[PDB]
Amino acid sequence: QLYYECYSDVSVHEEMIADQVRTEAYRLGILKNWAALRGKTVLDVGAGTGILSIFCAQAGARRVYAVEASAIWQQAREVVRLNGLEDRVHVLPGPVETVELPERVDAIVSEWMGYGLLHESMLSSVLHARTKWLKEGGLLLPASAELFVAPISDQMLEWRLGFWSQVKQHYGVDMSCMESFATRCLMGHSEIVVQDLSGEDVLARPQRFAQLELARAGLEQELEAGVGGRFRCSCYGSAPLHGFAVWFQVTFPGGKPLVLSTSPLHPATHWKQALLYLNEPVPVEQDTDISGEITLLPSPDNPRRLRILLRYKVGDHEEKTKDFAME
Amino acid sequence: QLYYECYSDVSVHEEMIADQVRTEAYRLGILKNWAALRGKTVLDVGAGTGILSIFCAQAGARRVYAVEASAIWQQAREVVRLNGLEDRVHVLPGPVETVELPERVDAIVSEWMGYGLLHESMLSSVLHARTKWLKEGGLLLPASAELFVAPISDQMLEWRLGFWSQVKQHYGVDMSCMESFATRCLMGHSEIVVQDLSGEDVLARPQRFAQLELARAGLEQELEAGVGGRFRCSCYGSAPLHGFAVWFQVTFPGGKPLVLSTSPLHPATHWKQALLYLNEPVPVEQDTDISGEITLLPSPDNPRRLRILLRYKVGDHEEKTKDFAME
Numbered sequence: 001q002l003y004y005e006c007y008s009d010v011s012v013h014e015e016m017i018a019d020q021v022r023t024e025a026y027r028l029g030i031l032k033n034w035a036a037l038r039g040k041t042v043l044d045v046g047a048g049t050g051i052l053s054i055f056c057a058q059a060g061a062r063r064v065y066a067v068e069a070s071a072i073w074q075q076a077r078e079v080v081r082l083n084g085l086e087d088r089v090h091v092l093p094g095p096v097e098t099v100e101l102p103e104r105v106d107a108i109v110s111e112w113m114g115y116g117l118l119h120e121s122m123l124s125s126v127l128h129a130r131t132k133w134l135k136e137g138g139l140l141l142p143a144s145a146e147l148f149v150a151p152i153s154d155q156m157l158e159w160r161l162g163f164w165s166q167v168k169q170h171y172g173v174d175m176s177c178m179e180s181f182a183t184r185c186l187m188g189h190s191e192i193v194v195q196d197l198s199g200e201d202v203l204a205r206p207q208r209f210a211q212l213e214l215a216r217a218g219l220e221q222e223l224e225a226g227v228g229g230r231f232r233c234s235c236y237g238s239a240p241l242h243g244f245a246v247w248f249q250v251t252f253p254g255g256k257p258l259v260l261s262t263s264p265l266h267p268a269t270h271w272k273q274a275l276l277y278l279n280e281p282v283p284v285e286q287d288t289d290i291s292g293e294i295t296l297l298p299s300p301d302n303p304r305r306l307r308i309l310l311r312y313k314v315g316d317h318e319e320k321t322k323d324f325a326m327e
Numbered sequence: 328q329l330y331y332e333c334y335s336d337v338s339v340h341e342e343m344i345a346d347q348v349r350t351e352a353y354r355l356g357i358l359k360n361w362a363a364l365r366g367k368t369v370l371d372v373g374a375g376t377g378i379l380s381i382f383c384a385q386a387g388a389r390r391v392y393a394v395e396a397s398a399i400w401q402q403a404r405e406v407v408r409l410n411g412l413e414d415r416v417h418v419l420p421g422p423v424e425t426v427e428l429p430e431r432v433d434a435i436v437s438e439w440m441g442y443g444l445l446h447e448s449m450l451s452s453v454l455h456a457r458t459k460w461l462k463e464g465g466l467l468l469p470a471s472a473e474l475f476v477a478p479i480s481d482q483m484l485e486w487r488l489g490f491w492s493q494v495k496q497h498y499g500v501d502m503s504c505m506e507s508f509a510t511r512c513l514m515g516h517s518e519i520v521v522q523d524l525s526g527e528d529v530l531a532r533p534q535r536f537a538q539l540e541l542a543r544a545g546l547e548q549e550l551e552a553g554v555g556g557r558f559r560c561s562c563y564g565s566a567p568l569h570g571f572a573v574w575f576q577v578t579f580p581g582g583k584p585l586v587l588s589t590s591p592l593h594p595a596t597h598w599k600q601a602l603l604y605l606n607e608p609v610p611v612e613q614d615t616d617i618s619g620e621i622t623l624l625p626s627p628d629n630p631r632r633l634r635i636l637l638r639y640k641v642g643d644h645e646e647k648t649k650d651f652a653m654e
């Protein structure tokens with residue numbers, strides 16, 4: 001039969017739906033808001049395969065507009081039909097910025113978050129839709145996002161760097177000189193690295209450095225100018241500091257609020273964490289103070305390519321700056 | 328400090344050295360040939376970080392020429408110095424096709440194998456070096472390669488395809504229509520897929536379909552015209568046939584010969600297996616006959632980009648052909 005070039009399309013959506021933490025958080029977050037959704041109209045921004053739109057219908061929404069710009073909208077329409085909802089869930093192809101709805105809506109639901117929250121995220125589209133299509137006093141799901149940072153001693157990176165000095169003990173050949181080379185290569189760059197960590201990697205109490213209430217005035221301008229803030233923490237114990245991890249949570253309006261977290265201390269998600277490596281490891285001790293500032297920015301070529309500007313000071317070392325971008 | 332673009336370089340060599348099966352097979356394969364190497368000269372084709380050249384010195388080689396074309400040759404020279412072998416192991420940058428050695432050699436050692444044995448493999452370079460630099464009656468390590476094929480029921484692919492029909496049981500939304508879409512996307516292409524399998528995936532006894540004795544007359548021409556052969560087998564039981572896996576082993580001349588295998592039935596290696604998916608699954612039963620022909624070819628744009636031409640016949644279905652390439 002025929003050959004197709006949609007491996008990427010299915011794999012992205014499989015990854016999302018198989019993310020139990022993500023998909024169940026949205027299912028429950030939507031269901032917990034049934035009193036606000038029942039008999040009401042909803043706009044699903046970036047509906048993908050349509051599953052959130054169907055969750056909304058199941059929570060009692062009268063009508064759902066499922067807007068999806070990629071080729072996958074066709075599958076969403078099939079999914080809607082298969083669940084017998086073609087009369088109340090309407091799949092509309094194209095960007096939400098130019099879609100034509102027949103009415104303003106009572107609520108917007110969207111899974112818009114990207115790596116590091118803002119990489120290739122749909123947030124500006126959600127905000128555009130809010131301004132254009134959401135009724136006054138209308139509901140946004142989720143309602144807010146919080147950003148966190150922690151210093152890390154990445155156990156996998158420590159193993160990769162230390163590997164070369166262990167070759168002698170396994171094969172009888174000294175390769176310890178490869179360590180400086182591996183350090184330059186794995187850390188001496190300014191790329192944001194997406195990797196999953198666990199609590200074993202966290203070197204101080206995670207710090208909330210920003211909060212975004214998605215309905216708030218001025219957020220579109222804050223995104224352009226940079227989202228972020230200062231942080232300070234104290235190290236748990238002796239370890240090589242490799243840099244910092246950034247992650248987020250989003251919060252659904254209450255029925256306590258339901259929180260979808262991407263912390264390394266919480267169940268893994270497909271978002272993992274966004275890692276900001278220093279150029280080389282820095283030894284730290286118990287109670288070493290670390291302070292800094294983290295700003296999430298658009299890239300100049302592309303506002304949806306995430307840039308992170310890090311200022312940091314470890315102990316009595318002078319403040320340093322490192323300017324990262326997603327690749 | 329400075330930023331570098333060598334993440335790829337360290338990661339490739341880390342992967343090789345951390346492949347215990349590979350690295351220990353070469354260590355032992357070389358050591359088992361100490362009587363042939365002792366007091367002799369060796370050419371290491373594609374020396375990388377230099378570890379095989381040092382194994383040769385440790386097996387008693389008088390002199391080793393370590394030829395490496397990529398930037399990593401510099402690290403090999405440092406590794407040699409660190410192990411006190413600068414007097415007998417000489418690292419020479421550039422392709423082996425144009426390197427100038429001061430003498431012909433008694434032996435060639437090389438880790439030349441690529442994915443599917445011949446993707447981006449150094450074999451033609453090894454053969455060039457054999458012709459130009461190896462003394463008559465000289466030793467090649469490894470000495471031979473064998474190629475295997477088996478029909479597979481890929482358990483991970485079965486799960487990915489069947490995932491969509493299971494969404495209803497986990498989230499209350501029917502997405503079974505996504506299955507045809509996922510099948511077209513994941514199987515309806517002609518790319519060779521590199522993936523690790525296990526015995527749970529093997530649907531019939533693996534078949535050897537070719538053997539390459541690396542010293543033999545005419546091998547360079549066989550590589551250009553295509554390496555391969557016919558196979559026949561009978562299925563173990565009822566399962567979806569997804570296609571075929573191809574893998575290899577290489578054999579070191581004897582001190583029984585030491586074999587480095589990349590079979591899914593044997594310890595995993597970084598080579599994994601090369602998977603050839605049909606356009607859609609084919610149901611088979613116990614004792615379903617499967618026959619075919621497999622040919623490994625150069626690509627027209629690039630002789631080192633692997634092409635695999637598959638002819639296959641499942642049961643009483645007509646013979647089919649599918650022409651694959653590495654991406």
Ligand SMILES: Nc1ncnc2c1ncn2[C@@H]1O[C@H](C[C@@H](N)CC[C@H](N)C(=O)O)[C@@H](O)[C@H]1O
Nearest residue numbers: 016046047048067068069070095096111122125
């Ligand atoms: N401006 C836009 N308008 C419409 N769709 C968009 C836009 N930007 C991104 N998308 C789509 O938004 C979807 C984002 C997904 N994270 C969410 C998929 C789906 N809602 C789910 O939760 O499984 C993707 O399918 C993108 O193709």
Ligand SMILES: Nc1ncnc2c1ncn2[C@@H]1O[C@H](C[C@@H](N)CC[C@H](N)C(=O)O)[C@@H](O)[C@H]1O
Nearest residue numbers: 343373374375394395396397422423438449452
């Ligand atoms: N024609 C060539 N001449 C010299 N080096 C080559 C050539 N083709 C490939 N290479 C290098 O060959 C090496 C192949 C590696 N598989 C082996 C590395 C090393 N011998 C090891 O076993 O760890 C890589 O470092 C390639 O850069």
